[PDB]
C-alpha cells in the first residue's frame, strides 16, 4: 500500500531587520510555521527562540533581535493580513509568504 504527501515551498521573510531576511523553505503540507521556522534554523542563517504559554509557543526573538516592552512578533501572511493563528497551529499553504513583524501596541 503506497503513502504519500506533499512538499511544499513557503517564502519566510522578516523586514523588521537590517538585513532582511527572505528565504524560500521547502516542508511538507500540513507543517505548522513553527516547522517552517525549524526547517530555516537548520538551513543555517535564520535563528529565533520562543516561550511557553497557555495557548502554546510564541516567539520572543527573531534573528537575534527580541521584542522588548509592549512589543511582539506579529505572524501575518503577505501582503499585509495578520494571522490570528499561533505559530504552532497555523498550516501554511504552498507558495504562501510569511511574515514576522515586530510591532508595539
Do not use: C
Not at 520562543?50 to 502554546?56: D, K, N, R, V, Y
Not at 516567539?59 to 501572511?77: C, D, H, I, N, Y
Request: net charge negative; hydrophobic share 35%.
Amino acid at each position: 500500500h503506497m503513502q504519500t504527501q506533499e512538499i511544499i515551498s513557503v517564502t519566510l521573510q522578516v523586514l523588521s531587520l537590517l538585513p532582511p531576511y527572505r528565504q524560500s523553505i521547502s516542508v511538507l503540507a500540513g507543517s505548522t510555521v513553527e516547522d517552517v521556522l525549524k526547517k530555516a534554523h537548520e538551513l543555517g542563517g535564520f535563528t529565533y527562540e520562543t516561550q511557553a504559554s497557555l495557548s502554546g509557543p510564541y516567539l520572543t526573538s527573531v534573528m537575534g533581535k527580541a521584542a522588548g516592552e509592549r512589543e511582539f512578533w506579529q505572524l501575518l501572511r503577505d501582503p499585509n493580513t495578520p494571522l490570528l493563528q499561533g505559530i504552532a497551529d497555523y498550516r501554511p499553504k504552498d507558495g504562501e509568504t510569511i511574515e514576522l513583524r515586530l510591532v508595539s501596541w
